[PDB]
Design an enzyme around this catalytic site. Sequence first.
Site, PDB file in Angstrom:
ATOM      1  N   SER A 113      68.332  28.427  19.538  1.00 37.55           N
ATOM      2  CA  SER A 113      67.373  28.831  20.550  1.00 37.55           C
ATOM      3  C   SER A 113      68.095  29.029  21.883  1.00 37.55           C
ATOM      4  O   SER A 113      69.073  28.344  22.185  1.00 37.55           O
ATOM      5  CB  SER A 113      66.276  27.784  20.663  1.00 37.55           C
ATOM      6  OG  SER A 113      65.429  28.032  21.758  1.00 37.55           O
ATOM      7  N   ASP A 118      58.869  23.766   1.745  1.00 38.87           N
ATOM      8  CA  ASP A 118      59.782  23.058   2.638  1.00 38.87           C
ATOM      9  C   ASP A 118      61.056  23.866   2.856  1.00 38.87           C
ATOM     10  O   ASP A 118      61.965  23.833   2.021  1.00 38.87           O
ATOM     11  CB  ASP A 118      60.107  21.677   2.044  1.00 38.87           C
ATOM     12  CG  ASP A 118      61.035  20.856   2.917  1.00 38.87           C
ATOM     13  OD1 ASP A 118      61.223  21.236   4.088  1.00 38.87           O
ATOM     14  OD2 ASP A 118      61.560  19.833   2.416  1.00 38.87           O
TER      15      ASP A 118
END
Length: 330
Positions: free
Chosen positions: A199, A35
Amino acid sequence: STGSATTTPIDSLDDAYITPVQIGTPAQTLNLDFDTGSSDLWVFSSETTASEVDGQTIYTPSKSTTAKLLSGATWSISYGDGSSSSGDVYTDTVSVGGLTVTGQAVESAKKVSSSFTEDSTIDGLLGLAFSTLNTVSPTQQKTFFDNAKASLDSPVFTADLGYHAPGTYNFGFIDTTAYTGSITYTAVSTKQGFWEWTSTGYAVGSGTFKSTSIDGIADTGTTLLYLPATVVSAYWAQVSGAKSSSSVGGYVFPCSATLPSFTFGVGSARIVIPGDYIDFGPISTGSSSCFGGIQSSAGIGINIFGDVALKAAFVVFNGATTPTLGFASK
């Protein structure tokens, strides 16, 4: 040193991935959910409330000659999905794919929430976010990666998740045969303890690319791709009959649909998520309403590049003094 381990989807939907981890001496192998959005290595154990164990493999520290109770240490964690666990702490030897750390904090669960009990395939979590998020008290502990880092050939790990197929976590090296083209690296902020990046935009299907900054985290422990409501609406508008269902808890679509791809930007590069990666199947057994793999982050407080996005790429988690993230197509 290096390590390399195969990671395997837990079910036919790729809801999560499990990776075998050796703990203790002799080794006790548990299948852990790696994770990158958390920083605790915790396991089902011989100390876990018996009614809360249902099929998981447990760590029994009393059977490990290298286990030592970390005196006074406790831990307690709550995840973004509302699940939680807590317990005490041992140090022990932990190996992943041939890479060994001695003195790793292994957090032994005394209590786990129902979601964990109900998932027989996940024996615990291995956190790979920054150690500043580790919940051990009163002395915070380091992640497996943080402990291994100085010994690694290069201070990196890579995630290569499969679509409906196994993939690989590598530690200490970049497998140049595992991706196509080049790896594009992008800046990381560690201020919130996550692999947080920006992004450069998105496209829906064969549509034009929209240049826009989307701050989010690279999170292998989250199934879906959670993005701003504007982006998500633009995606689902291209699927006839798709709608956001408050009762179901997100966007659903007719299972008869063919889904468009979704592209996200990494600098000037582009990662394409095929439409089929965005299909999470019937909302309930036998239903013709299917659950979408791209969902709104509104009210999460952060955008999450979870497995839906990451499995479309070869992803480098570069833990150099100034961390960065790399993405390549594959």
